[PDB]
Amino acid sequence: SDKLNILGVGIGGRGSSVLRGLESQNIIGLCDVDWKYADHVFKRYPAAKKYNDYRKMFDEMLKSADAVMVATADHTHAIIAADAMTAGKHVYVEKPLTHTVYESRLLTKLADKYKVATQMGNQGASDEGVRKVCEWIWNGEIGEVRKVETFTDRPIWPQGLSRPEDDQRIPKTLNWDAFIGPAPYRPYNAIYTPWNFRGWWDFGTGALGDMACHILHPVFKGLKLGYPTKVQGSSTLLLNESAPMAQTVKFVFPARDNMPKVAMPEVEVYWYDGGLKPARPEGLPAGKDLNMAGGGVIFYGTKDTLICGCYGVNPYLVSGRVPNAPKVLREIKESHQMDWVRACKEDADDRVPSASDFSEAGPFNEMVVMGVLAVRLQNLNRELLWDGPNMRFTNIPDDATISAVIKDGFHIKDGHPTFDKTWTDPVNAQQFAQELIKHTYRDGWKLPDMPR
Amino acid sequence: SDKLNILGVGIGGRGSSVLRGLESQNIIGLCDVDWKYADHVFKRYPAAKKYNDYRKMFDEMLKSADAVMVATADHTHAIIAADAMTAGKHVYVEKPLTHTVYESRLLTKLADKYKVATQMGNQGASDEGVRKVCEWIWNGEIGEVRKVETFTDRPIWPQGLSRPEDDQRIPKTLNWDAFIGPAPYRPYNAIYTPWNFRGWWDFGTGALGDMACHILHPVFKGLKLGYPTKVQGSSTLLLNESAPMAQTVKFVFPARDNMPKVAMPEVEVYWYDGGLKPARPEGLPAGKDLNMAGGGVIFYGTKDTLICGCYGVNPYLVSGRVPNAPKVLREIKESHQMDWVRACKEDADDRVPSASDFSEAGPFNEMVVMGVLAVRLQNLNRELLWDGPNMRFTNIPDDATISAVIKDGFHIKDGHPTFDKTWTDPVNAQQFAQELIKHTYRDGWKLPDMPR
Numbered sequence: 031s032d033k034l035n036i037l038g039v040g041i042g043g044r045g046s047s048v049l050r051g052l053e054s055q056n057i058i059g060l061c062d063v064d065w066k067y068a069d070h071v072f073k074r075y076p077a078a079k080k081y082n083d084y085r086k087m088f089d090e091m092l093k094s095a096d097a098v099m100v101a102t103a104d105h106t107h108a109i110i111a112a113d114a115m116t117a118g119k120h121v122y123v124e125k126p127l128t129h130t131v132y133e134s135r136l137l138t139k140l141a142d143k144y145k146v147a148t149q150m151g152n153q154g155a156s157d158e159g160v161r162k163v164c165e166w167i168w169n170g171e172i173g174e175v176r177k178v179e180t181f182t183d184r185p186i187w188p189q190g191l192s193r194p195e196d197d198q199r200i201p202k203t204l205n206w207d208a209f210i211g212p213a214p215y216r217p218y219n220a221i222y223t224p225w226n227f228r229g230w231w232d233f234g235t236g237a238l239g240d241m242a243c244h245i246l247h248p249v250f251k252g253l254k255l256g257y258p259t260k261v262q263g264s265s266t267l268l269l270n271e272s273a274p275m276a277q278t279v280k281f282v283f284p285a286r287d288n289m290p291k292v293a294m295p296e297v298e299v300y301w302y303d304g305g306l307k308p309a310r311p312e313g314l315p316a317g318k319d320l321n322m323a324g325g326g327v328i329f330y331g332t333k334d335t336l337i338c339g340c341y342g343v344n345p346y347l348v349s350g351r352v353p354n355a356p357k358v359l360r361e362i363k364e365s366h367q368m369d370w371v372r373a374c375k376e377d378a379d380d381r382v383p384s385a386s387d388f389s390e391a392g393p394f395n396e397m398v399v400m401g402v403l404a405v406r407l408q409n410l411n412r413e414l415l416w417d418g419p420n421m422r423f424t425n426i427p428d429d430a431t432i433s434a435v436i437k438d439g440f441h442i443k444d445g446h447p448t449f450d451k452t453w454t455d456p457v458n459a460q461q462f463a464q465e466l467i468k469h470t471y472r473d474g475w476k477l478p479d480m481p482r
Numbered sequence: 483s484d485k486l487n488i489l490g491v492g493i494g495g496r497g498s499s500v501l502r503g504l505e506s507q508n509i510i511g512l513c514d515v516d517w518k519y520a521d522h523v524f525k526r527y528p529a530a531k532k533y534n535d536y537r538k539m540f541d542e543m544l545k546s547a548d549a550v551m552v553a554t555a556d557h558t559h560a561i562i563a564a565d566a567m568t569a570g571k572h573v574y575v576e577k578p579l580t581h582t583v584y585e586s587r588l589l590t591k592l593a594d595k596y597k598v599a600t601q602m603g604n605q606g607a608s609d610e611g612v613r614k615v616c617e618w619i620w621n622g623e624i625g626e627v628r629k630v631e632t633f634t635d636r637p638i639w640p641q642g643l644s645r646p647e648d649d650q651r652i653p654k655t656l657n658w659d660a661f662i663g664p665a666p667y668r669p670y671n672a673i674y675t676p677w678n679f680r681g682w683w684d685f686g687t688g689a690l691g692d693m694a695c696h697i698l699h700p701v702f703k704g705l706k707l708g709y710p711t712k713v714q715g716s717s718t719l720l721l722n723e724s725a726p727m728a729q730t731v732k733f734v735f736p737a738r739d740n741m742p743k744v745a746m747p748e749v750e751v752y753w754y755d756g757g758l759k760p761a762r763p764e765g766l767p768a769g770k771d772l773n774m775a776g777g778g779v780i781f782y783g784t785k786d787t788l789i790c791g792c793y794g795v796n797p798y799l800v801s802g803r804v805p806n807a808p809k810v811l812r813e814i815k816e817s818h819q820m821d822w823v824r825a826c827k828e829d830a831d832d833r834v835p836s837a838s839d840f841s842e843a844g845p846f847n848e849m850v851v852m853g854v855l856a857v858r859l860q861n862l863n864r865e866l867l868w869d870g871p872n873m874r875f876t877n878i879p880d881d882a883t884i885s886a887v888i889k890d891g892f893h894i895k896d897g898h899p900t901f902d903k904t905w906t907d908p909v910n911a912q913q914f915a916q917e918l919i920k921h922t923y924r925d926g927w928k929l930p931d932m933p934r
């Protein structure tokens with residue numbers, strides 16, 4: 031075989047471009063819950079069998095397949111990728127890898143156990159920018175880094191939404207039940223899909239899922255990060271079902287092993303989104319935009335400051351100097367899609383992993399999705415202390431409760447303001463947190479077990 | 483110590499409580515543009531003459547008066563206060579003192595020149611919390627302070643509004659033209675007044691004017707701040723007519739003279755609003771809410787960290803120490819209103835200033851309203867350098883521009899997102915900045931000249 035047999039799952043949007051990148055291989059089956067939105071894609075590949083439920087497609091065609099591309103809404107990435115991998119299939123899974131920390135940990139351990147090739151779809155990991163960021167840091171060009179600031183201008187779509195009140199009929203071209211997948215059932219509405227799932231906690235991850243995997247990748251790889259020890263967030267109005275218009279997250283990562291030319295001390299990483307930006311770094315010329323391609327990253331080293339854009343693009347040092355550092359990272363010639371295909375075909379003993387192999391991308395996505403935890407737990411009024419190995423917070427009190435705003439009810443009558451707002455009934459904070467870290471799947475939807 | 487003859491201007495909201503605080507004096511005339519909203523207040527003082535235009539009331543009654551209470555929308559405070567002061571009258575003017583930098587500088591110099599008693603309406607300046615904050619700092623209890631963080635949970639009303647497009651008839655109880663005052667004319671709508679002027683750049687100052695004078699007072703007086711040297715801000719979606727949902731501002735203030743027990747080095751002050759908070763200070767117990775009575779302040783000293791709420795309330799030290807520091811500030815026994823009345827009656831040669839005398843409140847309000855500048859100028863992508871003496875920024879390029887969003891146009895059609903936005907026509911940034919610092923008054927409305 032020179033051609034992989036690939037099944038595509040979630041094809042109408044980003045999946046479309048990913049499949050174009052994989053087109054030289056064999057697209058034998060395509061699954062999409064929405065046969066209207068995805069129609070143009072099924073008709074670029076007339077020969078592939080059409081499905082509208084991945085489980086049906088898997089039962090019929092996982093024999094014929096080597097690999098699965100997944101570009102569904104975030105909340106279903108895990109269950110799909112896990113079923114594919116446990117059947118011994120290679121997987122390309124769009125960023126963010128999974129909806130939850132637990133799901134990321136599971137995909138990481140499954141990739142190892144079944145020895146398949148994996149690729150999270152953060153395509154910047156395969157470009158030149160990151161390679162420079164890493165090589166500069168590792169060669170001592172900026173000294174040690176105790177503080178990084180990062181941001182995106184996303185969200186650029188409306189968030190902070192309330193559950194829409196009208197009921198809508200489910201189009202006959204849409205398999206609403208399979209869209210819901212393991213999440214709690216709720217009535218259909220177009221506000222949820224296509225595309226707009228990003229703002230709903232049960233289905234997407236807000237700006238963190240939209241952008242963070244692109245923005246933070248050079249931070250995570252360059253500073254060799256693992257599990258954070260602490261995290262805290264704040265946001266604009268935090269609703270119970272929808273993510274906020276803007277948020278800030280501060281992580282702390284412990285010291286790692288030093289490298290010959292650069293120490294790796296404890297490091298704070300700040301995240302800003304929704305218009306908020308870090309303060310301008312000292313020495314940067316007035317007027318230089320910190321946003322390049324949707325965001326920025328600032329590494330504050332003891333000898334200099336390294337700044338890059340989203341996707342690791344166009345790194346520079348604020349001193350103006352251009353280093354000439356030793357090359358250490360594999361220089362990737364294929365697209366992000368095709369570099370994975372290469373890996374899929376090398377024997378497992380011998381395999382050169384692609385750039386977003388889940389052995390990196392898993393722990394990385396756990397940082398991204400921890401942003402969501404921090405923000406959703408902000409009313410606990412504490413720095414949250416994370417035990418990474420055991421996937422729990424250690425300092426949420428037994429009797430703490432958490433509630434969220436359902437709807438802002440501000441009104442003015444004849445000049446007199448009223449500040450009403452509905453709140454959810456307080457729930458136990460530890461159980462709410464535990465459930466965000468690891469969801470209770472709706473009956474009929476099951477993850478494979480954690481190995482061992 | 484007979485009774486002051488007081489005129490009131492802007493009486494239907496806050497003015498109502500302020501008049502209650504002054505009621506043992508003679509309320510001889512009241513002016514309000516809105517005779518429906520303000521009716522209950524006119525009828526608590528049936529012997530005062532009623533007016534709906536301050537200029538009319540001043541031409542008839544400034545002879546008879548000693549003092550004027552101003553609690554109008556922000557954009558009219560300065561012209562009213564200034565006309566009163568130039569006639570030799572004492573003034574109580576609600577926070578924020580003025581809409582603009584220039585107007586604050588003018589009210590400051592008029593107060594000195596005419597030797598009248600003044601009081602900005604930040605009533606926290608007369609309570610005990612700030613005395614403790616100041617006394618602890620000045621006695622060296624927390625060492626030197628290089629960093630302060632501050633915030634409020636406001637706005638708790640909707641901002642980010644677009645100009646309404648419907649035609650609304652002017653109620654016959656409303657003097658819309660006198661509401662506009664020196665601002666640019668626009669069509670009437672109830673969205674602007676009463677109360678809701680706060681989020682419109684032409685009339686209010688957003689969360690900064692609603693809360694900052696309350697929150698930052700202990701910072702400004704405790705660290706003996708004057709003019710900042712630098713400022714920068716970011717926000718959620720910055721619109722052309724309405725303030726954003728949330729914002730951050732960083733000020734830098736230069737070193738002042740040291741006091742015997744505490745040095746006064748260069749200090750950075752941060753401001754956050756609309757849900758955003760500063761990261762939790764090191765040492766603060768888990769669970770302790772940083773918001774007390776609407777926000778909070780954190781002073782990071784070399785020896786300890788001092789935290790207070792809004793209004794300077796309930797100051798404490800993170801180490802748990804409670805100092806016993808020498809008393810230095812006058813212990814104010816009368817209300818914030820009546821402490822001003824006392825000052826009004828002392829001869830100017832002898833006068834003990836009330837706690838929000840414009841000699842402090844003027845420069846303080848300049849910091850507040852500088853936050854508005856920073857946010858409205860954020861597209862310049864630079865830390866702005868402020869020359870306080872000359873009321874100008876020194877590093878805005880002569881050909882730079884500013885454009886703002888008029889209306890977000892996001893929509894989804896058949897799952898495809900479209901991201902359009904209308905923008906204003908770019909204007910020259912120096913002219914735009916100069917105009918925010920010093921408004922061009924609408925024809926027929928003039929300030930007194932700056933004294934020298």
Ligand SMILES: NC(=O)c1ccc[n+]([C@@H]2O[C@H](COP(=O)([O-])OP(=O)(O)OC[C@H]3O[C@@H](n4cnc5c(N)ncnc54)[C@H](O)[C@@H]3O)[C@@H](O)[C@H]2O)c1
Nearest residue numbers: 040041042043044062063064101102103106124125224225
């Ligand atoms: N790498 C990048 O640059 C990038 C860019 C855009 C999107 N993404 C990611 O790709 C994913 C998809 O987002 P999008 O913008 O393509 O969204 P979208 O909703 O436009 O397209 C998703 C498609 O998947 C289908 N789908 C959803 N759930 C399904 C399920 N359970 N089974 C089968 N089909 C299902 C939908 O019907 C739709 O056609 C998200 O993970 C998003 O984070 C990555």
Ligand SMILES: NC(=O)c1ccc[n+]([C@@H]2O[C@H](COP(=O)([O-])OP(=O)(O)OC[C@H]3O[C@@H](n4cnc5c(N)ncnc54)[C@H](O)[C@@H]3O)[C@@H](O)[C@H]2O)c1
Nearest residue numbers: 492493494495496514515516553554555558576577676677
């Ligand atoms: N010190 C505090 O704690 C505190 C609390 C609330 C309000 N404020 C301040 O008080 C001021 C008033 O705000 P508010 O909430 O009372 O607003 P409001 O709109 O409820 O009341 C303002 C009143 O003044 C009238 N008014 C407006 N412009 C006028 C003008 N040019 N001439 C005459 N009357 C006019 C309005 O009709 C209304 O009666 C604002 O500057 C606000 O910052 C201070």
